[PDB]
Amino acid sequence: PTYFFTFGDSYSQTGFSASGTQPSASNPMGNPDLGIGTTTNGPNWIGYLTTTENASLVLSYNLAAGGATIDNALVPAYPGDLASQFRLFEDVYADKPASAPWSAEDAVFGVWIGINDIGNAYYSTDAETYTPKLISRLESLVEEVYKNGGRKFLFLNVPPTSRSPLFLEQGEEVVKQHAEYLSVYNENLEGMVDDFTKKKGDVTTVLYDSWSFMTKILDDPTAYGFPDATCINDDGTSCIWWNNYHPGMKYHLLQAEDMKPKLRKLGGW
């Protein structure tokens, strides 16, 4: 099987507990049931990659936690920052236990972080000098998994949360300030992933440009079956937005479909 360990924020959360039912062939998410615990009204991108877009057996260990930032020593928010998710991984799965006997050839580490770091710091920090600190801390966490023997990595860049209803309501100049800051973060993320890839020489990496994908939908919503780019519906399917800051299940399914061909080199797609 492919062991898919994920790390991130509310765009990735499912409510998976390390003490809940663990992933197996008959139950690849482990816990909770597929479609529960998300910000989408249904499966999220991880549920869809694991159970709908998979080419072979994928087992999902999803450590993402709502509200997470990279490290509370930089931009703080909630206790379950990315650093704490890596610590949970180190405590339970890093040593390849019988419940998750992974190897360099069959483990994929997916990270989707930055929404909240940017969301909280875009007006109070200098993007050009501050976002390298965030990205360097992300890289140091990734190095912990590399030391454990991880070699396959998936990074998603930050999507245009500047154009969520929550931000649009703050005025176009705030949308722009946030978007400009976000663009610098994503450029630095790309640089780091490229540099890591070249320096190690023995890793398989994907940088998934969620920003451009979601932007395409926001720019032409009706081509994707949405009536406009701003409406909210908690059914997760009628609108792009499930709530004012989170996209719904239909969006996540469209993203997972977009991702599938780009993930073929990682082993489960």
Short mmCIF file of C-alpha atoms in Angstrom, two decimals:
data_model
loop_
_atom_site.label_atom_id
_atom_site.label_comp_id
_atom_site.label_asym_id
_atom_site.label_seq_id
_atom_site.Cartn_x
_atom_site.Cartn_y
_atom_site.Cartn_z
CA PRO A 1 0.00 0.00 0.00
CA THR A 2 0.85 3.72 -0.15
CA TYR A 3 1.11 5.29 3.35
CA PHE A 4 -0.16 8.86 2.95
CA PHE A 5 0.75 11.02 5.93
CA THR A 6 -0.78 14.49 5.75
CA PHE A 7 -0.16 17.69 7.68
CA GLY A 8 -2.05 20.97 7.49
CA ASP A 9 -4.99 23.10 8.63
CA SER A 10 -8.77 23.19 8.31
CA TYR A 11 -8.56 22.78 4.52
CA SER A 12 -7.19 19.30 5.31
CA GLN A 13 -8.65 18.30 8.70
CA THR A 14 -10.77 15.12 9.05
CA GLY A 15 -10.64 14.55 12.86
CA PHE A 16 -8.32 11.54 12.60
CA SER A 17 -7.13 10.35 16.02
CA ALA A 18 -3.89 8.49 16.52
CA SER A 19 -5.82 6.38 19.10
CA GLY A 20 -8.84 5.88 16.85
CA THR A 21 -9.37 3.05 14.41
CA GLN A 22 -6.25 2.81 12.28
CA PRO A 23 -6.09 2.65 8.46
CA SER A 24 -6.51 -0.71 6.78
CA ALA A 25 -7.41 -2.06 3.34
CA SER A 26 -11.07 -2.29 4.34
CA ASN A 27 -11.00 1.15 6.02
CA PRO A 28 -8.30 3.38 4.41
CA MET A 29 -9.11 6.59 6.35
CA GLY A 30 -8.99 4.75 9.69
CA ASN A 31 -11.14 7.30 11.51
CA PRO A 32 -13.51 8.97 11.32
CA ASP A 33 -15.74 7.61 8.51
CA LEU A 34 -14.99 9.06 5.08
CA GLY A 35 -16.94 12.34 4.78
CA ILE A 36 -16.88 13.22 8.49
CA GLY A 37 -14.69 15.83 10.27
CA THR A 38 -14.12 18.21 7.37
CA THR A 39 -14.85 21.79 6.40
CA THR A 40 -16.65 20.67 3.20
CA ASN A 41 -19.91 18.92 4.14
CA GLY A 42 -18.38 15.66 2.88
CA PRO A 43 -15.04 14.23 1.79
CA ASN A 44 -12.19 16.67 1.44
CA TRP A 45 -9.25 16.52 -0.99
CA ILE A 46 -7.51 13.87 1.14
CA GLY A 47 -10.61 11.68 1.32
CA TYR A 48 -11.02 11.98 -2.43
CA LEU A 49 -7.35 11.23 -3.16
CA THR A 50 -7.45 8.22 -0.83
CA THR A 51 -10.75 6.63 -1.84
CA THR A 52 -11.92 8.06 -5.21
CA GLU A 53 -8.83 9.09 -7.25
CA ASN A 54 -6.56 6.31 -5.98
CA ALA A 55 -4.98 3.90 -8.50
CA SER A 56 -4.08 1.38 -5.79
CA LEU A 57 -4.46 1.06 -2.03
CA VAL A 58 -3.80 4.31 -0.19
CA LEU A 59 -3.88 4.43 3.61
CA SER A 60 -4.53 7.93 5.07
CA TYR A 61 -2.99 9.10 8.37
CA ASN A 62 -4.25 12.68 8.47
CA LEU A 63 -2.65 14.79 11.17
CA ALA A 64 -4.01 18.15 9.91
CA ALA A 65 -5.65 20.30 12.58
CA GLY A 66 -8.02 23.24 12.34
CA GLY A 67 -6.49 26.70 12.58
CA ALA A 68 -2.90 25.49 12.30
CA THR A 69 0.01 27.73 11.57
CA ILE A 70 3.54 26.45 10.87
CA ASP A 71 5.04 27.11 14.32
CA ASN A 72 3.60 29.03 17.23
CA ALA A 73 7.08 30.56 17.81
CA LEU A 74 6.57 32.47 14.51
CA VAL A 75 2.88 33.17 13.74
CA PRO A 76 0.85 31.65 16.64
CA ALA A 77 -2.74 30.50 16.62
CA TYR A 78 -3.76 27.10 18.02
CA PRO A 79 -1.83 24.43 19.96
CA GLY A 80 -1.95 21.99 17.04
CA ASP A 81 0.48 23.87 14.80
CA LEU A 82 2.39 22.07 12.02
CA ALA A 83 5.32 21.59 14.44
CA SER A 84 3.00 19.69 16.83
CA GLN A 85 1.67 17.54 13.96
CA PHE A 86 5.25 16.53 13.09
CA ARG A 87 5.81 15.73 16.78
CA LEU A 88 2.72 13.50 16.77
CA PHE A 89 4.15 11.75 13.67
CA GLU A 90 7.55 11.35 15.40
CA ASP A 91 5.85 9.95 18.52
CA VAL A 92 3.59 7.38 16.79
CA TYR A 93 4.50 6.61 13.19
CA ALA A 94 8.09 7.73 12.47
CA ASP A 95 9.59 4.47 13.73
CA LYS A 96 7.52 2.41 11.27
CA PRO A 97 5.31 0.44 13.72
CA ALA A 98 3.47 -2.68 12.77
CA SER A 99 0.30 -0.56 12.29
CA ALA A 100 2.12 1.56 9.70
CA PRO A 101 5.22 -0.27 8.45
CA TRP A 102 6.16 2.24 5.84
CA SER A 103 9.27 2.56 3.71
CA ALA A 104 10.91 5.20 1.50
CA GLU A 105 9.31 3.53 -1.54
CA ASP A 106 5.69 3.54 -0.30
CA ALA A 107 5.31 6.57 2.00
CA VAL A 108 4.02 9.95 0.76
CA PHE A 109 4.16 13.03 3.02
CA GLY A 110 1.69 15.71 2.06
CA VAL A 111 1.76 19.22 3.53
CA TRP A 112 -0.74 22.00 3.00
CA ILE A 113 0.07 24.93 5.29
CA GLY A 114 0.32 28.72 5.12
CA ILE A 115 -3.31 29.85 4.93
CA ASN A 116 -3.30 30.89 8.59
CA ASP A 117 0.30 32.17 8.75
CA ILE A 118 -0.56 34.58 5.95
CA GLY A 119 -4.08 35.20 7.23
CA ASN A 120 -2.64 36.33 10.60
CA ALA A 121 0.55 38.16 9.56
CA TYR A 122 -0.09 39.75 6.13
CA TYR A 123 -0.50 43.27 7.52
CA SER A 124 1.97 43.12 10.42
CA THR A 125 5.09 41.65 8.78
CA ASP A 126 7.33 42.28 5.78
CA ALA A 127 6.63 39.43 3.30
CA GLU A 128 10.06 39.56 1.67
CA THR A 129 12.01 39.13 4.95
CA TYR A 130 9.37 37.33 7.07
CA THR A 131 8.10 34.62 4.71
CA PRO A 132 11.61 33.08 4.41
CA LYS A 133 11.50 32.47 8.19
CA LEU A 134 8.19 30.64 7.83
CA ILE A 135 9.46 28.59 4.86
CA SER A 136 12.75 27.76 6.60
CA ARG A 137 10.81 26.40 9.58
CA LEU A 138 8.65 24.32 7.22
CA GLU A 139 11.83 22.95 5.66
CA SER A 140 13.28 22.04 9.03
CA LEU A 141 10.13 20.08 9.87
CA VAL A 142 10.31 18.28 6.52
CA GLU A 143 13.90 17.40 7.41
CA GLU A 144 12.65 15.49 10.46
CA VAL A 145 10.72 13.11 8.17
CA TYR A 146 13.68 12.92 5.77
CA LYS A 147 15.82 11.77 8.73
CA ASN A 148 13.19 9.11 9.51
CA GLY A 149 13.61 7.85 5.91
CA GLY A 150 10.85 9.69 4.04
CA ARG A 151 11.64 10.39 0.36
CA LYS A 152 8.27 11.20 -1.37
CA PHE A 153 6.73 14.63 -0.71
CA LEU A 154 3.67 16.55 -1.83
CA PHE A 155 3.40 20.28 -1.13
CA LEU A 156 0.33 22.34 -1.92
CA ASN A 157 0.77 26.09 -2.31
CA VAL A 158 -1.62 28.45 -0.62
CA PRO A 159 -4.93 29.00 -2.52
CA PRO A 160 -6.51 32.48 -3.02
CA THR A 161 -8.15 32.83 0.38
CA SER A 162 -7.80 36.56 -0.41
CA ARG A 163 -11.02 36.02 -2.42
CA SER A 164 -12.95 34.12 0.24
CA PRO A 165 -16.07 35.93 1.45
CA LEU A 166 -14.32 36.57 4.78
CA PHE A 167 -11.62 38.62 3.06
CA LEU A 168 -13.75 40.20 0.34
CA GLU A 169 -15.86 41.76 3.11
CA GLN A 170 -12.74 43.61 4.42
CA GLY A 171 -12.44 45.64 1.22
CA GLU A 172 -10.57 45.29 -2.02
CA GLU A 173 -7.38 46.96 -0.69
CA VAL A 174 -7.21 44.32 2.08
CA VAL A 175 -7.82 41.59 -0.51
CA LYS A 176 -4.89 43.05 -2.46
CA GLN A 177 -2.59 43.42 0.59
CA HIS A 178 -3.26 39.81 1.55
CA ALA A 179 -2.90 38.56 -2.05
CA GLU A 180 0.44 40.32 -2.51
CA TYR A 181 1.80 38.82 0.68
CA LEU A 182 0.48 35.38 -0.29
CA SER A 183 2.20 35.59 -3.67
CA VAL A 184 5.61 36.12 -1.97
CA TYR A 185 4.98 33.18 0.37
CA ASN A 186 4.11 30.89 -2.54
CA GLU A 187 7.20 32.00 -4.53
CA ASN A 188 9.39 31.24 -1.51
CA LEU A 189 7.62 27.86 -1.02
CA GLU A 190 8.39 26.95 -4.64
CA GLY A 191 12.03 27.97 -4.18
CA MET A 192 12.38 25.85 -1.08
CA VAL A 193 10.78 22.77 -2.67
CA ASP A 194 13.06 23.12 -5.70
CA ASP A 195 16.16 23.61 -3.53
CA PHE A 196 15.28 20.69 -1.23
CA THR A 197 14.68 18.45 -4.25
CA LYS A 198 18.01 19.30 -5.85
CA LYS A 199 20.09 19.22 -2.65
CA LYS A 200 18.83 15.77 -1.52
CA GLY A 201 18.92 14.19 -5.03
CA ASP A 202 17.02 11.14 -3.80
CA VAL A 203 13.53 12.58 -3.29
CA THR A 204 10.40 12.57 -5.42
CA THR A 205 8.49 15.82 -4.96
CA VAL A 206 5.34 17.50 -6.26
CA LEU A 207 4.45 21.13 -5.78
CA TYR A 208 0.75 21.38 -6.50
CA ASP A 209 -0.37 24.84 -7.60
CA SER A 210 -3.71 25.01 -5.85
CA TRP A 211 -3.58 28.77 -6.25
CA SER A 212 -3.84 28.70 -10.02
CA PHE A 213 -6.49 25.97 -9.97
CA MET A 214 -8.84 27.64 -7.54
CA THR A 215 -8.20 30.99 -9.32
CA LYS A 216 -9.41 29.47 -12.58
CA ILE A 217 -12.67 28.45 -10.92
CA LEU A 218 -13.13 31.82 -9.17
CA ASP A 219 -12.52 33.59 -12.50
CA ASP A 220 -15.07 31.43 -14.42
CA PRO A 221 -17.35 29.74 -11.84
CA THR A 222 -20.09 28.75 -14.24
CA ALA A 223 -17.67 26.62 -16.36
CA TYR A 224 -17.44 24.39 -13.25
CA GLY A 225 -21.16 24.39 -12.47
CA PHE A 226 -21.11 27.09 -9.75
CA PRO A 227 -23.42 30.10 -10.12
CA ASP A 228 -20.86 32.73 -9.03
CA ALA A 229 -17.57 33.00 -7.12
CA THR A 230 -18.97 34.47 -3.86
CA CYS A 231 -22.07 32.56 -2.68
CA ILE A 232 -21.93 30.34 0.42
CA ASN A 233 -23.86 27.09 0.85
CA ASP A 234 -23.19 24.55 3.62
CA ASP A 235 -24.39 21.70 1.35
CA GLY A 236 -20.82 21.97 -0.02
CA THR A 237 -21.93 21.60 -3.67
CA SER A 238 -24.20 24.53 -4.67
CA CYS A 239 -21.46 27.12 -4.18
CA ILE A 240 -17.65 27.22 -4.13
CA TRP A 241 -17.80 28.15 -0.44
CA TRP A 242 -19.08 25.91 2.36
CA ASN A 243 -18.64 28.81 4.80
CA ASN A 244 -17.04 32.23 4.52
CA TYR A 245 -13.47 30.87 4.57
CA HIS A 246 -13.65 27.24 3.39
CA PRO A 247 -14.53 25.67 0.04
CA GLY A 248 -17.00 22.79 -0.18
CA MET A 249 -16.81 19.16 -1.16
CA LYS A 250 -17.47 19.84 -4.85
CA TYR A 251 -14.47 22.16 -4.98
CA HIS A 252 -12.35 19.61 -3.12
CA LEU A 253 -13.39 16.86 -5.58
CA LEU A 254 -12.50 19.08 -8.53
CA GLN A 255 -9.12 19.79 -6.94
CA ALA A 256 -8.44 16.11 -6.24
CA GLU A 257 -9.30 15.32 -9.88
CA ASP A 258 -6.92 18.05 -11.02
CA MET A 259 -4.23 16.66 -8.72
CA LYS A 260 -4.50 12.97 -9.74
CA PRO A 261 -2.32 13.12 -12.93
CA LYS A 262 0.26 15.26 -11.12
CA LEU A 263 0.53 12.63 -8.33
CA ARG A 264 1.26 9.60 -10.56
CA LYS A 265 4.96 9.82 -9.72
CA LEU A 266 4.18 9.54 -5.95
CA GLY A 267 2.79 5.98 -6.26
CA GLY A 268 -0.93 5.79 -5.41
CA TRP A 269 -2.51 7.65 -8.31
#
